[PDB]
């Protein structure tokens, strides 16, 4: 979709939302790509065969639409898993004393 060039494709598809080290296996399954594909890859006939396998995935941005509403559903029921989002609470039953900083 908006991937960068001049790097290897096993790390290049990671740059979008929704892919981490599945391009090593799952995108490598459907497409006949290799590991050493730089910017000089000629991935335009290979752009189509990755477009068929990425169309099944929720990855490119649209997963964050469903991820946002899952929190919005969770706070609307007002669950203890959901109040901890709206209140800076670590949510997954953690100790909210001194070393609980990344939620503030």
């Amino acid at each position: 979709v908006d991937i960068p060039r001049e790097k290897r494709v096993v790390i290049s598809l990671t740059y979008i939302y929704g892919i981490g080290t599945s391009t090593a296996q799952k995108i490598l399954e459907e497409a006949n790509v290799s590991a050493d594909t730089r910017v000089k890859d000629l991935t335009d006939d290979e752009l189509g065969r990755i477009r068929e396998v990425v169309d099944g995935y929720k990855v490119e941005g649209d997963l964050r639409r469903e991820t946002n509403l899952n929190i919005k559903r969770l706070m609307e029921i007002s669950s203890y898993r959901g109040i901890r989002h709206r209140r800076g609470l670590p949510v997954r039953g953690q100790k909210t004393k001194n070393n609980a900083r990344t939620r503030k």
Binding site: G61, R65, N68, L69
Partner: protein
């Protein structure tokens, strides 16, 4: 202007047989829909007003009128000017294109049981439905809009009392 005939059906099939009007002219008729968004005090929202004037064009395809203040009320930061509103009066076929769209997509996306009211009138024939912006952009999904908001849709008819405006709102409306 396809489903305008829904009104032209109900003027003579239900309304002549309900109140027994003596002429076809004095059936209650809807004249305007104003979709006045509200205030949204713009000490910062003057940039969100540029979003709020962009969202309301997507709901109804007419540019809003950015209505400014009138008084100099304290405990509120505003003067003459300071544009703190937006509205679109929907007169013609864009009304029915908006009405025969919204009354099918207002109750479902709000996730309410009954949904609007049994009564919201003012004793004259005006409804003033209240919206917390759970319905709009049904075509492009939640991708590029920024801030949650709340609309207000007013239905102004030529009804005379409450019970004749209940009759027009009983045509694919849910009271």
């Amino acid at each position: 202007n396809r489903l305008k005939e829904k009104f032209n059906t109900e003027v003579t099939e239900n309304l002549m047989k309900k109140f027994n009007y003596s002429s076809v002219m004095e059936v209650p008729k809807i004249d305007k829909i104003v979709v006045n968004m509200g205030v949204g005090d713009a000490v910062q929202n003057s940039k969100v007003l540029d979003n709020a004037v962009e969202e309301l064009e997507l709901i109804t395809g007419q540019k809003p009128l950015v209505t400014k203040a009138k008084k100099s009320i304290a405990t509120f930061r505003l003067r003459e000017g300071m544009p703190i509103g937006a509205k679109v009066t929907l007169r013609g076929e864009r009304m029915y294109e908006f009405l025969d769209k919204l009354i099918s997509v207002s109750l479902p996306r709000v996730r309410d049981f009954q949904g609007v009211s049994k009564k919201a009138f003012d004793g004259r024939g005006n409804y003033t439905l209240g919206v917390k912006e759970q319905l709009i952009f049904p075509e492009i999904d939640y991708d590029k809009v920024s801030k949650v908001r709340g609309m207000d849709i007013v239905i102004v008819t030529t009804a005379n009392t409450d019970e004749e405006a209940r009759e027009l709102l009983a045509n694919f409306g849910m009271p």
